[PDB]
C-alpha cells in the first residue's frame, strides 16, 4: 500500500504535468487577446474623440478599473449584495463552489467569510449526505417499477442491477447535466458547450466563476433564479450517491 | 429521518439568510460607493472632454469593463500559461479549489477541462484519502512517544487522548495554517488577515480566486508556485484526515 500510494502520487504528478502541457498548448496563443481588445478600444476612442489625449484616456481606464474593482457595474437590480445575491454568495461558500465573480472588499467580510465557511461547509455536507441518501432511495425505488419490466422479460437480475445503475446515472444526467444546459443555453445566451462547461464546473464544485447563472432577481421568467438555487443542491447530492459507489469500488479493488 | 431532514433544510436556509444579511451589511455600502465613484469619474470626464456624449462614454466603459473582465491590465498597452502556472491551474481543478484568476479562452481548453476534471478530481480524492490515512497514522503514531510521558504522570487516559488530539491539531495548525500565512504575508506582500483568508479559502477548497499565491506578474519564482501546491496537498489531506477522525469519535 506504501508502494501503491507513491505510484499513485507519481501518476497524479504526470497527470498534472500532462495537463500543464495541454492547457499551455491550447490557451497560451490566446493569452494576449483581452489586452489587444482593450488597446483596440482605446485606439478607436482616440480616433473618434480628438479632444482626448492617449494619456488622459489612460487615467480614465485606471479610474474605471478601480471602480469596477470596488464592485461597480457598467450602467446602461445590478446590486450584487442585495439579499438575493448575498444569499447566493453565502451558498457558493457552504457548497465550496466559490465562484468569486463578486469578491469581498471589506476585511470585516473576509474575516466573517472565514467563520461562515468553517461552520457552514460541514453543516451543508451533512444535509448533502442526507438529501443524497433520501433522493437516491426514492430514485432506486422509482427504477424498481422499470426493474419489474426487465424481470418479467426474464433478464438475469444482476444485469438488471447494472441496467438500473445505468438508468440511475442517465435519468439524473438527463435532469441535472442535460436539462440545465438546454435551460442555460436559452436563458444566459451561452453556446451548448459553454453551458455544459458551467454545469460540470459547478457540480464538481471547482466553480472557476468565468461563467455564473448569477442568482440576480429579474423578470421575463422570474421563476428562473429560484430554480437555479434548488438545482445545485439536487445536482451535488446526485453526484454524491454516484461518486461514493465509484469511490468505494476503486479503493477496495 | 424525514423530520430531521426538513429541520436540517430549514436550519441551512436560515444559515444562508443569516449569511446574506451579514455580507450585505458589510459589503453593500462599499459596492454602492464604488458605483458612485464610477459615475463621478464619468461626469468629471464629460465636463473635461466635450467631443464625447454621455452615451458614447457609456459604451467605452462597457467595452473597457469587458476587456478588464477578460484579464486585460489597465497599466500597459500590448505569461499566465507558462509551464509553472499551467501546472498550478491543473492543480486547482483536481483539488476542486478552482481559483479561476486566469480562465480559459478556447472551446478546446474548456471541453478538455471537463474530461480532465471528471478523471482528475476522483483520482486525487483517492490520493487525498491515501495521504490522509498515512499522514494521520504518522502524527498519532509519532505523538504517541511524547504522549507516553503524560500517561505515566497519571492524567486520566480519556483526557490524555484529548490533550494528544489538541497537540495533534495545534502542531498541524502550526505547520499548515500559521506557517503558510506568515510565509504568504512576507512573500505576496499581503496583510496577516489577507493571508489567513487566502489559506482558509484555499484549504476549504472554496478557492474564490480574489487572492492567489504566485499569480503576481512581477515574480520570477519558478519553484514557488508549483511548491505552494506541495503545501495544498499536505493541508487538504490534514484538513480531510482530522475531520474524518473527528467523525469516528462523534458517531
Amino acid at each position, epitope marked *: 500500500r506504501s508502494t501503491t500510494l507513491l505510484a499513485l502520487l507519481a501518476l497524479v504528478l504526470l497527470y498534472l504535468v500532462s495537463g500543464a502541457l495541454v492547457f499551455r498548448a491550447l490557451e497560451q496563443p490566446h493569452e494576449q487577446q483581452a489586452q489587444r481588445e482593450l488597446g483596440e478600444v482605446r485606439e478607436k476612442f482616440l480616433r*473618434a474623440h480628438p479632444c482626448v489625449s492617449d494619456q488622459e484616456l489612460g487615467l480614465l481606464i485606471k479610474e474605471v478599473a478601480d471602480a469596477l474593482g470596488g464592485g461597480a457595474d457598467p450602467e446602461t437590480s445590478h446590486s450584487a449584495w442585495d439579499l438575493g445575491s448575498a444569499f447566493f454568495f453565502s451558498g457558493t461558500i457552504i457548497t465550496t463552489i466559490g465562484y468569486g465573480n463578486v469578491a469581498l472588499r471589506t476585511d470585516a467580510g473576509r474575516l466573517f467569510c472565514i467563520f461562515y465557511a468553517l461552520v457552514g461547509i460541514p453543516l451543508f455536507d451533512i444535509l448533502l449526505a442526507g438529501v443524497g441518501d433520501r433522493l437516491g432511495s426514492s430514485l432506486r425505488h422509482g427504477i424498481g417499477h422499470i426493474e419489474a419490466i426487465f424481470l418479467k422479460w426474464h433478464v438475469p437480475p444482476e444485469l438488471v442491477r447494472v441496467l438500473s445503475a445505468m438508468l440511475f446515472l442517465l435519468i439524473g444526467c438527463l435532469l441535472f447535466v442535460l436539462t440545465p444546459t438546454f435551460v442555460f443555453c436559452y436563458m444566459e445566451d451561452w453556446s451548448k458547450l459553454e453551458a455544459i462547461y458551467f454545469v460540470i464546473v459547478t457540480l464538481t464544485t471547482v466553480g472557476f466563476g468565468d461563467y455564473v447563472a448569477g442568482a440576480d432577481p429579474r423578470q421575463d421568467s422570474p421563476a428562473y433564479q429560484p430554480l437555479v438555487w434548488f438545482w445545485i443542491l439536487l445536482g451535488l447530492a446526485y453526484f454524491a450517491s454516484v461518486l461514493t459507489t465509484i469511490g468505494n469500488w476503486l479503493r477496495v479493488v | 429521518r424525514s423530520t430531521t431532514l426538513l429541520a436540517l433544510l430549514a436550519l441551512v436556509l436560515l444559515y444562508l439568510v443569516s449569511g446574506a444579511l451579514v455580507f450585505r451589511a458589510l459589503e453593500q455600502p462599499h459596492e454602492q460607493q464604488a458605483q458612485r465613484e464610477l459615475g463621478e469619474v464619468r461626469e468629471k470626464f464629460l465636463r473635461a472632454h*466635450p467631443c464625447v456624449s454621455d*452615451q*458614447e462614454l457609456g459604451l467605452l466603459i462597457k467595452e473597457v469593463a469587458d476587456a478588464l473582465g477578460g484579464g486585460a491590465d489597465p497599466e500597459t498597452q500590448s505569461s499566465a500559461w507558462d509551464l509553472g502556472s499551467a501546472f498550478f491551474f491543473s492543480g486547482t481543478i483536481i483539488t476542486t479549489i478552482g481559483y479561476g484568476n486566469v480562465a480559459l479562452r478556447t472551446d478546446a481548453g474548456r471541453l478538455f477541462c471537463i474530461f480532465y476534471a471528471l478523471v482528475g478530481i476522483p483520482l486525487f480524492d483517492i490520493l487525498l484519502a491515501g495521504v490522509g490515512d498515512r499522514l494521520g497514522s504518522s502524527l498519532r503514531h509519532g505523538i504517541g512517544h511524547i504522549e507516553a510521558i503524560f500517561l505515566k504522570w497519571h492524567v486520566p487516559p480519556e483526557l490524555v487522548r484529548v490533550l494528544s488530539a489538541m497537540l495533534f491539531l495545534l502542531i498541524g495548525c502550526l505547520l499548515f495554517v500559521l506557517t503558510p500565512t506568515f510565509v504568504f504575508c512576507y512573500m505576496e506582500d499581503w496583510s496577516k488577515l489577507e493571508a489567513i483568508y487566502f489559506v482558509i479559502v484555499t484549504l476549504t477548497t472554496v478557492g474564490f480566486g480574489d487572492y492567489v499565491a504566485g499569480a503576481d506578474p512581477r515574480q520570477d519564482s519558478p519553484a514557488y508556485q508549483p511548491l505552494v501546491w506541495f503545501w495544498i496537498l499536505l493541508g487538504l489531506a490534514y484538513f480531510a484526515s482530522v475531520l474524518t477522525t473527528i467523525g469516528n469519535w462523534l458517531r
Partner: antibody
Amino acid sequence: EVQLQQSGPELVKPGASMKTSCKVSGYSFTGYIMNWVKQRHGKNLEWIGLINPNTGYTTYNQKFKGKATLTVDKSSSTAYMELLSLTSEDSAIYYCTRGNYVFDYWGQGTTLTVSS
Amino acid sequence: QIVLTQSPAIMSASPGEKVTMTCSASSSVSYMHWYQQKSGTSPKRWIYDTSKLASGVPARFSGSGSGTSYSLTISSMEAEDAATYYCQQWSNSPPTFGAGAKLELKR
C-alpha cells in the same frame, strides 16, 4: 460669440414629415454635442435626442425614438432634425442646444404647426 | 427618466424680496442646472454645476443643493428677474427638466 441659428417656422399637413436645421458659429461644430429640445405650448421641456456631429452617433428619448431623425452636415456646420408622420401633438417650439451635461447655448427656436 | 419636481409652478415677489425656488429629484443627482426663459425667447443657461453662474447672470442669483434637493435663490428680486426658471439634470441619461417655476412681479 457662439450662436445657433435655426431655420424659420414650418407649417406642415397632418401625416407629412418635417426637417428643420440649425447652423452653429463662434466655435467648432464638430467639437461639441448637439441636442434637440421640444417645448410644447410653453410647458415642460422634453429632450428629443443628441448627435455627436464628429462621430454621427445619435441617441433618442425612447418617447421620440421613431419620430425624430438627427443628422449633421460637417461641411456647412449644420445640424438637422426630421420629424415623421406628424400629428397635432407635434405642434411645438423646437430648439437645437449644445452640451454633454448642461445645455450652454440654445438656438432662437423653431415653431412647428401641424394643421390642415 | 429621473423626475424633477418644481413646486410651486407659480410664485410672485415684490422687488427687493428674497426668492428661493426648489427642484427635488426622484432619485439622487450629482449636479443640477438651471435655465431662465423670458416669454418669446428660448431658454438661457442661468446656473450650471449646481451653484456656478453663466456669464451674463448677475451676482444676486445663487444655486445650491445636493442629492435630491436643489434650490435657485435671488438675494434681492429685480423686475428683470421675472421669468420662468427650469432645473435640468444629466447625472443619468436621458437628461430631464422640471415643469418650470414661473416668477411674476408682485404689485
